[model samples]
Target: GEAPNQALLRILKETEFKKIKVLGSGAFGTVYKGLWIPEGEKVKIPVAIKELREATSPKANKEILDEAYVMASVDNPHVCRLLGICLTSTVQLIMQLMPFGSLLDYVREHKDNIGSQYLLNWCVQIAKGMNYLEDRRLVHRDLAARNVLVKTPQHVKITDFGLAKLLGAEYHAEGGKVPIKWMALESILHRIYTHQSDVWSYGVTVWELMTFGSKPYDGIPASEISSILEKGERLPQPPICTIDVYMIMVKCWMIDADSRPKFRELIIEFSKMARDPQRYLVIQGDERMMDDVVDADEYL
Candidate 1:
């Protein structure tokens, strides 16, 4: 065996983890809660183990490994931590579990309690994470509210980088199941993907954050979305989103991908919004739930 380049990753043993309840499942995949007991650690820490769909095939296994390599070596506070990988019945990508769960779910449940500043802060965190990804030359072809995990109101991490690809060439999915709803125009029509394409998804994700997780273009048929966008129609500004902040989202939705500002500018814009939420993000209602908002000090 030629094993001399660097710290070699070893095949993970199944016995190392105690799989618990299923956290979530969708057509895409299923994730489970687990207690990971490393080789010598006495404590069994909690984590999420993703069982990749269609992982039984040999080609899919290679893809899993490719994804695992990216997750394992990636170092960013705003990005999900890849604890390790497990193999036995199926391939599992272990990750540090966020106590608060998916950002989309969190926003919906506690929308009344979260102030405008906190939501803006979350966007800043997401921008910082994506900026980190861009610096690494990795393109996250599927960025969305559901792909973000929240640890608390103040912090969140970008997750589900299974479709991530490194720079060098524009990436394209070969099949029917692409994230067209969140994709840029160039990506949806031409099968081309880049960092700017991710920006388009970011705009959609911000809409989700502002609206407390409404489906993008709800009730619109997937078949007609491209035509709708070709006509210059985009997701309407969420009712709760302030004009100052919505401009940031609009810029990211620029039809010409290169016209959109990069993550650096996004970080600056979101930071300014977060710093002066009163001046920019004016929430009008939720009077009945004023007590809940008052109890939450982190956002205040």
Candidate 2:
């Protein structure tokens, strides 16, 4: 018997979809750009279809179902909306098409076209989306620019919930590889994942925007990141980053997770900065003065 929600799920027929191209691919699956035509409908809806590799183990299949469950549970402008799931010869998760693709790729390709205000808006959108998850007691274990999808020039959506988890009072520990560069010190060391850790990754994503998609800790090897981070070292502020925004990033990198600002607070700060760009602008004459403005206590 199908679940109650499954009644609404559409079973895609082989003749209904025509694969246009491969949007992206990773270890677990490949996303494809396709044209989907419903039965008796004249209009063909453009969609992104995520197809998992065949011969997947029960554990892997559960993970895919879990991702679908998490995405289905949330409804926000900033979070990617899941359309439906198809369980045929291969499992497919249908989603709204994000024309601009991943935020990382978008920023890299359109950095010149994106101004500070737009960049800040992107950050705010992500914060708001994460805040929505926080309200639902959900934690995105992996929140990076690469996982963000650009919906339009002015809007973005957080996607790829393969690593997401629902949070309780205590930190959830998982034995698996994580994006070390975007992870908080506590997460890297203790495997403790909480909303605060997501905040940490959000900060790194901000850094990605500031640097136009430059790799976090560019020269540093992943093997040494834990040790380097343990020694109170953090990624240096990008050359174009203003002191105010950089300060927020530093706060996100706080050694004590509790010290980091919540996503709601982050959205507020980002909004303020975006609204008053002149006030937070980096002055050329007193470049060194920017150094003194950030609180030493906020960072490692």
Clash pairs detected, candidate 2: none
| Candidate 1 structure, TM-score to reference | 0.86
State each model's C-alpha RMSD to the native: 6.4, 9.9
What lDDT does candidate 1 reach at residue 217? 86
* lDDT (Cα, tens digit) per residue for candidate 2, span 119-227: 7788899999999988877889899999998877888999988788866434656777778899988888888888898999999999998888999988777789999
* Model 1 per-residue lDDT at 249: 86
Candidate 1 weakest ten by summed lDDT? 291-300
Cα error of candidate 2 at position 183, Å: 0.6
lDDT of each: 0.80, 0.80
Best by TM-score: 1
Error of 2 at 293 (Å): 50
For residues 45-90, write the lDDT of model 1, one tens digit per residue.
6678788776667877787788788786567789886777778556
- Total clashes, candidate 1? 0
